[PDB]
């Protein structure tokens, strides 16, 4: 049988052109450990080969290698080319004869056996902004103070980078509202100065508890440099714990020197929510030490024991309980009850 | 013929330039080098105090103080180590690649207890990375207070200092550059000395000067605070550390509000020597399988200094929840002291770690409640391992727990199944679905549950990956109840009833086969269906229903394979149901009756729905149901 | 007062030990160093031949030959470079950290064209990693043939060689150790010289001696074969390389049977200088998103030598299919020449690469046919990018194509939708499902398709991730048709009909609400349903049906969140369907008739099925259907 010209392709077969049909010759060298892959190619080619189409005598071709050669069915997606159904081997077989491992004659390699655990991805549902989520429902003060602590951590992490997010309102903020999972809050500015953003987040905190913020209603919502003419503070409902009332009272205060920065407010919220109600927290009785910081962390889990349904609470505990300093914590545990005592 | 021998010498300028610029990746390393050298001097003077304590009369305490001064851009590192003499100063700090520590150690006796950090001889000159001029003032016994000063210009000046008496100690004074003045504040200093050199056997005390002076109201006149608070307990011998100290070590090492769950503390004493400490957390990290670029939380230490983290070949991927440290006393170390020379060593460490933590899991399984907590929180990792590695799979299998038909409400291991297996039973029947309740009432398990056999409920997507490679357990083979060729140990009159039902319904299956054409590849009389008209089942080879659904819904999937690996359905009918008998009457009466055609189409649709498959176009089924409703109501 | 200045000197022995052992990770590096130094000598002698060609009369050709000899364990690297004199030999190979190449380059004029590899001064001594004794024989003009021998013992010998005349050249003779005799054969040599130093401007010729001598039948008496076959075309200027040469370069760089798809060849000339070449393959790799530990196929070259691969910060993850090289003329390089000093540089490279390849994609989108192939094969990567990065999302959006109701059979971009949007239409209605056919006939799109509006078919799981962050496109907002609060631009009599239908069916919805209790949170009259009795819809905030199904079927999922993020259903009825009217008659007639209870239960089941939700326990629905069938047949 005549054939065409010699070219190399794929490094696993020859390519001629017979008399026109293409004889994709197959050259197997059974002296190397890759010949097992090459016998796999011997099997995976000739998918439509007839069962009785072999033309190699048994005295020259080993029946054990060619008995399951003829394929009943096989997808064979990778390689497209094909050869006719025959094989040639020297009567006294070539050097480094096939070992005849007699391995798994009746077995079929299940095509598509190779599967893979693909890369895992995360989903963050951002359905609404803060204003809509608080106009449809208003949660209880626990996770409300939790969301305020999230906002305070965010606004601290922002300005500590140098830039001043002066414009911060109910609409700029986005809420990753999990359907029944507690809503995680994120800061953004899709809608286009120190402690001013803290004033804004204090007004928004007054808003979150379901009460209209008078600094948003009548005006002066841009920044407090335009000093409001009330010169008082609006009365949040008494249902809120007086701790966060004192917090939002001091944060949006007139004086710019007394306003506690975002870090002291964040970790005083850490103390109030997570660190249980202890006389050490009050009357500034805790002597601040890193040991007492780890003791407070040891007091932090008792906020999971009763509040564990909130995935947000465990998330924040994993995220922010590590990042808190001794100095700001001392200032927080000082202020929290140098107000509350009012001595 | 004529042979002129010589001896290598070096060009000093370019050598110093190379040492400064081309060795270390990040400039923050310099702190680790100075701290380690100071600790080396500290243990040096400690060792000699054993023989004679009078040499300690200069200074009792052994500590390291850092005094950053922002006014002059000077970061001072002062200690009370052994110090240097003049000639020692010249020979050590002048001669590049010479380390007095190595000389002192080799000159020491054979059986000694010191473990000094460095021996290379170039670590000090790294200080230049962030300084223009370096000044070393040191006073050591047998010599007076001398002053070193160099600008890395190839020259250094040694002058007898006339400052204040320092006693036996050594202080290094750096003059930082404006580009690197960031290291002056305390935040980066804390972060560095906690990342590297946290486990140093001597107290490190920062000396910030944050005095407010706001007028009695002044606070923090001078702040002395320790940083290396927690001692390295893994150095201590086990059987003495109670289960408590591990708790504080866990809380300090990783910020956490709760104790650990279990601890494994072991050590290897071969030619490759290292000790290890392994913690299994009580809470699974929320972002664990979320790829945080943090592959392994295992930290690698060499002589109590940090080396490398998140080098995945340390521990296999599925064991990433494990948190702990591994410390070796000596290893081949790249010059920058940030990676090993031959990574082959990491493989042995990996094997030892995996076998030890598997033993740990095995011992943990001895308790029920603790294990339940562990499994419930980390079961996915075990199945991942079963899917990935192929040499501990045999030992990984026992760990698995499962819901069974006879289990009740609590999970149970495969060994319990094997013990409760009947004498003639020779397989382990498992059924994979999407929820326990739906699986428990499925159509496939009816005959089994009636016969008394037990079945396994696999109700999470991660299952299929595990079971498809876990094809056998302790001589008994796993068989899925939703496979075509399902057989159960029955009697012979059962076979006679089956063959007579075949010879009775052999025409009806052909009749239903010409209808439903190319929707199902075969329709035969069932042997596993009781109190259900008909159920569909996939072929023996290929994807099952739930597997195909899972990897069709899997993101980042390859479309060609999804078309390639599609299941071949096979419908099965219950010859005992009244519906089937009446349908056979109607079929044998009228070969083709439209009523039969639509009825069997609807039956196949409902069977496909219940079998776990997802219907192709549910609108047609909904329209058929709506037509049935309108017919029933008279519209 | 008295100041004794000095000057650093070095301890040679430990310095050499450090250079040998502690610098390079894998011993195979040594070949790259010798080859680069030989190429440096080659371009050295090339430069000087420009002024006078007589200095080239010694040897015309410029090549590098490797002659491994297994009989004597000698790997010889012989070239025809410039060579050295005796004094040059001593000063360069004897003095550590001195590099004659840097001296020659700086001594050269300012505007010259040479780009030599190394300037540090220690690369040569790396040969010791795999040799006990090194012998360098070199003959250079103005001097005779000299020989250098060293065993890294702190001594070197220089003797006038009396061997064969080599002409102007230099040959290095290594004596390997038995542990490293593997490098003698040709396979590892080929693999190394192709991995590193493949793009060297001079021919490298292996000299294996595989003569069979099997007796005329002898073959391969002596084998001279080149290895650096393909020239680096990126060095050449664009607008001269035709679209062909890129093909051969692609085939050679990466073994492939087919040409590339598109090529981007650009260059940056700022203070950070580098050229780049980017190929987009014609076939998507099958194992692409399969994590092969190969994150980026982009190779980083410095002066035409390999540096690093698979360092993910080079290119973002979703652009991993891009294959190509990036070559810089100068960069801060770690001493081992395997990583950069400050990784900040990689960020700028990443930004430039991403903006350039996005411009490439934009230009590719100009040709519809080509784009169609490219988008069909790599669409998943674009959506991944849209999901991950948040600064090119605006520019990545245009690239997306989609099936629409009015599209027909071919995909279409969002700009086409925006152009075909009506005047009063103010949103972009999209519907996500699992297959085009089922979505096209769904119940939600009926009223829309009737009104004439267009809708978008998203039929792959990767969609949801993209759309949930792609909340807006060019002033127009994306709205899902399977959300609760869906509104369409209608007239006022439409509103009157709607409110009168509400005032007619306001009791029936309560009646159906007390039934189906805690299965659906609300039941109201619909405004989007025509020719369908009832459909269910999820709340405005929370997962939609397909999203919940997808991330329920997603492996490695966190169970707590799956319980947390569950959709809140809302049933909607069509007040025009005859079934609804008759049901209202029956309800207003008998407050509580069971016929009505079971009927509405079944209706809700079918609606839940068609709406895309997966039924909880399909066995109950199947039993209801079987009861209906048995009733219809008279059983
Ligand atoms: N604080 C110190 N007190 C006494 N000697 C020191 C001090 N710091 C460095 N040295 C000496 O300087 C020599 C050179 O330091 P170097 O070789 O860079 O560090 P190492 O010895 O850890 O490799 C060391 O042999 C050490 O003895
Ligand atoms: N084949 C060669 N022909 C001529 N000179 C060489 C050859 N190989 C090395 N050299 C010289 O040896 C000196 C030291 O080499 P080394 O510094 O290790 O490499 P590099 O100069 O690339 O850093 C170089 O300055 C170079 O001039």
A110 Cβ neighbours under 8 A, 6+ residues apart = B541, B542
Substitution target from A81, A119, A123, A315 for chain C, most C beta carbons within 10 A:
A123
Token code pair at residue B279: 């913690």
- The single-letter DSSP state of residue B127 is G
Distance CA C437, CA B616 (A): 9
Nearest Cα to Cα of residue A267 among A106, A149, A99: A149
The shortest C-alpha distance from C313 to chain A (Å) reads 18
B424 touches chain C (CB under 8 A): no
B441 touches chain C (CB under 8 A): yes
φ, ψ at C413 (rounded to 5°): -90, 170
Which residues of B participate in the annotated binding site for ATP? Answer: 37, 79, 98, 124, 337
The shortest C-alpha distance from B362 to chain A (Å) reads 27
* C245 contacts C224 by C-beta, under 8 angstroms: no
Task: Please name the member of B437, B610, B621 whose beta carbon is closest to the beta carbon of C622.
Answer: B610
Quickly tell me which residue has 């650093």 as its tokens.
C8
Ligand 2 atom 27 nearest Cα: C100
- Residue C119: how many other CB atoms lie within 10 Å: 15
* A329 contacts A265 by C-beta, under 8 angstroms: no
| Helix (H) or strand (E) run with residue B204 in it | strand B204-206
Residue of A nearest to C283 (CA): A78
Rounded to the nearest angstrom, the distance between the alpha carbon of C121 and the centre of ligand 2 is 8
Size of interface A-B (CB pairs under 8 A): 53
Distance CA B209, CA B223 (A): 6
Distance CA C10, CA B103 (A): 16
Residue of A99, A102, A156, A167 marked catalytic: A167
- The single-letter DSSP state of residue A14 is E
Token code pair at residue A11: 């490094």
With CB atoms and an 8 Å threshold, state whether B286 touches A315.
yes
Residues in chain C: 635
Size of interface A-C (CB pairs under 8 A): 66
Nearest Cα to Cα of residue B255 among C360, A293, A66, A33: A293
With CB atoms and an 8 Å threshold, state whether A311 touches C561.
yes
Burial class (CB in 10 A: 0-12, 13-18, 19+), C98: buried
Residues with CB under 6 A from ligand 2: C 36-38, 40-41, 79, 81-84, 92-93, 99-101, 117-118, 120-124, 170
Q: What are the start-end ranges of the E strands in B224-339?
A: 225-226, 262-269, 273-280, 297-302, 306-309, 323-328
Strands C297-302 vs C323-328: parallel, antiparallel or unpaired: parallel
What are the angstrom distances between the C-alpha of B10 and each of B5, C8, C14, C94? Answer: 17, 10, 12, 8
Nearest Cα to Cα of residue C483 among C447, C429, C405: C429
Distance CA B578, CA B585 (A): 11
Distance CA C154, CA C581 (A): 104
Task: Please name the member of C287, C387, C541 whose beta carbon is closest to the beta carbon of A177.
Answer: C541
Using a CB-CB distance cutoff of 8 angstroms, which residues of chain B are in contact with residue A118?
Answer: 554-557
Is the CA virtual torsion C307, C309, C314, C315 positive or negative? Answer: positive
Q: Cα dihedral angle (C46, C51, C54, C55), rounded to 10 degrees? A: -40
C128 touches chain A (CB under 8 A): no
* C544 contacts C431 by C-beta, under 8 angstroms: no
Token code pair at residue C386: 């849209």
Residue of A nearest to C566 (CA): A179
The shortest C-alpha distance from A297 to chain B (Å) reads 5
Token code pair at residue C108: 């050269």
Token code pair at residue B53: 């304590």
- The technique is cryo-EM
What are the angstrom distances between the C-alpha of C181 and each of C22, C34, C69, C176? Answer: 21, 18, 10, 6
* Domain spanning A128-340: CATH 1.10.510.10: yes
Reduce the DSSP state of residue C414 to 3 states and report it.
helix
Residue B84 beta carbon below 6 angstroms from any ligand 1 atom: yes
Ligand nearest to the CA of B101: 1
Residue B93 beta carbon below 6 angstroms from any ligand 1 atom: yes
With CB atoms and an 8 Å threshold, state whether C540 touches A10.
no
* C135 contacts C173 by C-beta, under 8 angstroms: yes
Residue B39 beta carbon below 6 angstroms from any ligand 1 atom: no
Using a CB-CB distance cutoff of 8 angstroms, which residues of chain A are in contact with residue C471?
Answer: 126
Using a CB-CB distance cutoff of 8 angstroms, which residues of chain A are in contact with residue C564?
Answer: 178-182, 311
Phi-psi region of C110 (alpha: psi -120 to 50; beta: other; left: phi over 0): alpha
- The single-letter DSSP state of residue B92 is I
Q: Cα dihedral angle (A223, A225, A230, A232), rounded to 10 degrees? A: 90
Which of C:362-401 have CB within 8 Å of B? 380, 384
Give the neighbours of chain C: at least 3 Cβ pairs within 8 Å. Answer: A, B
The shortest C-alpha distance from A124 to chain C (Å) reads 8
C568 Cβ neighbours under 8 A, 6+ residues apart = A179, A180, C521, C538, C539, C542
Residue B169 beta carbon below 6 angstroms from any ligand 1 atom: no
Residues in chain A: 343
With CB atoms and an 8 Å threshold, state whether C540 touches A127.
yes
Query: How is the beta sheet containing B523-525 ordered, strand by strand?
Result: B523-525, B569-573, B534-538
Distance CA B340, CA B621 (A): 65
Ligand nearest to the CA of C137: 2
Residue of B nearest to C2 (CA): B159
Quickly tell me which residue has 């056999």 as its tokens.
B453
The shortest C-alpha distance from C360 to chain B (Å) reads 24
Angle between helices C578-589 and B618-633 (to 10 degrees): 50
Rounded to the nearest angstrom, the distance between the alpha carbon of C6 and the centre of ligand 1 is 19
Residue B324 beta carbon below 6 angstroms from any ligand 1 atom: no
Which of C:505-524 have CB within 8 Å of B? none
Rounded to the nearest angstrom, the distance between the alpha carbon of B62 and the centre of ligand 1 is 17
Nearest Cα to Cα of residue B457 among B396, B412, B393: B412
- The single-letter DSSP state of residue B10 is B
Using a CB-CB distance cutoff of 8 angstroms, which residues of chain B are in contact with residue C155?
Answer: 5-8
Token code pair at residue A64: 């054990």
Nearest Cα to Cα of residue B535 among B455, B598, B599, B611: B611
With CB atoms and an 8 Å threshold, state whether B380 touches C556.
yes
* A98 contacts A65 by C-beta, under 8 angstroms: yes
Contacts 24+ apart (CB under 8 A), A44-47: A44/A74, A44/A76, A44/A78, A44/A79, A45/A76, A45/A79, A45/A81, A45/A82, A45/A83, A46/A70, A46/A71, A46/A82, A46/A83, A46/A84, A46/A85, A47/A71, A47/A73, A47/A74, A47/A76, A47/A82
With CB atoms and an 8 Å threshold, state whether A119 touches B291.
yes
Ligand nearest to the CA of C65: 2
Residue B221 beta carbon below 6 angstroms from any ligand 1 atom: no
- DSSP assignment of C151-183: -SSS-EEEEE--S----SEEEEEEE--GGGGGG
Domain ranges of chain A: 1-121, 128-340
**Ligand 2 atom closest to the CA of C79, numbered from 1:** 1
What are the angstrom distances between the C-alpha of C485 and each of C180, C446, C501, C538, C580? Answer: 74, 16, 18, 10, 22
Residue of C nearest to B578 (CA): C635
Distance CA B524, CA B529 (A): 12
With CB atoms and an 8 Å threshold, state whether A120 touches B560.
no
Q: Cα dihedral angle (C198, C200, C201, C207), rounded to 10 degrees? A: -70
* C43 contacts C36 by C-beta, under 8 angstroms: no
Q: Would residue A180 show up in a list of annotated catalytic residues for this protein?
A: no
């Amino acid at each position: 049988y005549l054939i065409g010209q010699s070219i190399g392709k794929g490094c696993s077969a020859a390519v001629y052109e017979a008399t026109p049909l293409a004889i994709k010759m197959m050259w197997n060298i059974s002296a190397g450990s890759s010949s097992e892959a090459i016998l796999n190619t011997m099997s995976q080619e000739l998918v439509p080969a007839s069962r009785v189409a072999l033309a190699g005598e048994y005295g020259a071709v080993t029946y054990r290698k060619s008995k399951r050669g003829p394929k009943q069915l096989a997808p064979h997606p990778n390689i497209i080319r094909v050869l006719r159904a025959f094989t040639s081997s020297v009567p006294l077989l070539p050097g480094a004869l096939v070992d005849y491992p007699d391995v798994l004659p009746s077995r079929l390699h299940p095509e598509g056996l190779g599967h893979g655990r693909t890369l895992f991805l995360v989903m963050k549902n951002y359905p609404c902004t803060l204003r809509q989520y608080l106009c449809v429902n208003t949660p209880s003060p626990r996770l409300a103070a939790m969301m305020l602590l999230q906002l305070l951590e965010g606004v601290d992490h922002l300005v500590q980078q140098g830039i001043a997010h002066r414009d911060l309102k109910s609409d700029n903020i986005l809420v990753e509202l999990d359907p029944d999972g507690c809503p995680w809050l994120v800061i953004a500015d899709f809608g286009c100065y120190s402690k001013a953003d803290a004033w804004a987040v204090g007004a928004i905190a007054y808003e979150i508890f379901g009460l209209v913020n008078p600094f948003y209603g009548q005006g002066k919502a841009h920044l407090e440099s335009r000093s409001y003419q009330e010169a008082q503070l609006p009365a949040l409902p008494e249902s809120v714990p007086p701790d966060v009332r004192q917090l939002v009272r001091a944060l949006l205060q007139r004086e710019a020197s007394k306003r506690p920065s975002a870090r002291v407010a964040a970790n005083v919220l850490h103390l109030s929510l997570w660190g249980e109600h202890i006389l050490a927290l009050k009357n500034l009785k805790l002597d601040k030490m890193v040991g007492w910081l780890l003791q407070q962390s040891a007091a932090t889990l008792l906020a999971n024991r009763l509040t564990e349904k909130c995935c947000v609470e465990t998330k924040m505990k994993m995220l922010f309980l590590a990042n808190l300093e001794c100095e700001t914590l001392c200032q927080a545990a000082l202020l929290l009850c140098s107000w509350r005592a009012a001595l | 013929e004529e042979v002129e021998t010589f001896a290598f010498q070096a060009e000093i300028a370019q050598l110093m330039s190379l040492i400064i610029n081309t060795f270390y990746s990040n400039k923050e390393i310099f702190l680790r080098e100075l701290i380690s050298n100071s600790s080396d001097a500290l243990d040096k003077i400690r060792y000699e105090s054993l023989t004679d304590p009078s040499k300690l009369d200069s200074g009792k305490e052994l500590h390291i103080n850092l005094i950053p001064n922002k006014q002059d851009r000077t970061l001072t590192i002062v200690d009370t180590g052994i110090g240097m003499t003049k000639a020692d100063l010249i020979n050590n700090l002048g001669t590049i690649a010479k380390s007095g520590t190595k000389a002192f150690m080799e000159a020491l006796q054979a059986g000694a207890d010191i473990s000094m950090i460095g021996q290379f001889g170039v670590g000090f000159y790294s200080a230049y990375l962030v300084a223009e001029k370096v000044t070393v003032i040191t006073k050591h016994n047998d010599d007076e207070q001398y002053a070193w000063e160099s600008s890395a210009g190839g020259s250094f000046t040694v002058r007898t200092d006339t400052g204040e008496p320092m006693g036996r100690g050594t202080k290094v004074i750096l003059h930082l550059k404006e580009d690197q003045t960031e290291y002056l504040e305390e935040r980066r200093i804390k972060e560095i000395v906690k990342k590297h050199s946290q486990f140093i056997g001597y107290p490190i005390t920062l000396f910030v000067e944050k005095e407010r002076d706001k007028e009695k109201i002044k606070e923090k006149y001078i702040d002395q605070e320790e940083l290396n608070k927690t001692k390295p307990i893994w150095t201590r011998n086990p059987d003495d550390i109670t289960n408590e100290e591990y708790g504080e070590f866990y809380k300090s090492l990783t910020n956490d509000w709760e104790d650990h769950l279990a601890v494994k503390h072991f050590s290897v004493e071969g030619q490759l020597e290292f000790r290890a400490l392994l913690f299994v957390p009580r809470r699974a990290p929320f972002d664990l399988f979320e790829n945080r670029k943090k592959k392994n939380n295992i930290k690698l230490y060499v002589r109590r200094v940090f080396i490398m983290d998140n080098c995945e070949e340390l521990i296999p991927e599925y064991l990433n929840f494990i948190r702990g440290v591994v410390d070796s006393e000596d290893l081949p170390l790249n010059i920058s002291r940030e990676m090993l020379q031959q990574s082959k060593i990491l493989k042995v460490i990996r094997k030892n770690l995996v076998k030890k933590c598997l033993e740990l899991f095995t011992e943990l399984a001895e308790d029920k409640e603790n294990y339940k907590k562990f499994y419930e929180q980390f079961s996915k990792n075990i199945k991942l391992g079963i899917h990935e590695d192929s040499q501990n799979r045999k030992k990984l299998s026992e760990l698995l727990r499962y819901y069974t038909s006879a289990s009740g409400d609590e999970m149970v291991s495969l060994k319990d199944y094997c013990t409760r297996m009947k004498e003639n039973q020779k397989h382990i029947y498992y059924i994979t679905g999407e929820t326990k309740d739906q699986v428990a009432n499925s159509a496939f398990v009816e005959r089994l549950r009636k016969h008394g056999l037990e079945v396994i409920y696999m109700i999470e997507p991660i299952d299929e990956y595990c079971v498809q490679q876990l094809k056998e357990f302790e001589g008994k083979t796993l068989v899925s109840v939703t496979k075509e060729g399902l057989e159960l140990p029955e009697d012979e009159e059962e076979k006679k009833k089956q063959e007579e039902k075949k010879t009775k319904f052999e025409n009806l299956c052909k009749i239903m086969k010409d209808i439903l054409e190319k929707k199902v590849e075969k329709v035969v009389v069932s042997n596993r269906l009781v109190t259900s008209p008909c159920c569909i089942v996939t072929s023996t080879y290929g994807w099952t229903a739930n597997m195909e659904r899972i990897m069709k819904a899997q993101a980042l999937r390859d479309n060609s394979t999804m078309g390639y690996m599609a299941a071949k359905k096979h419908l099965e009918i219950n010859p005992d149901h009244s519906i089937i008998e009446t349908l056979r009457q109607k079929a044998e009466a009228d070969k083709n009756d439209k009523s039969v055609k639509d009825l069997v189409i609807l039956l196949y649709e409902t069977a496909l729905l219940s079998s776990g498959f997802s219907l192709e176009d549910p609108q047609t089924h909904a329209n058929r149901i709506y037509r049935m409703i309108k017919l029933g109501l008279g519209i």
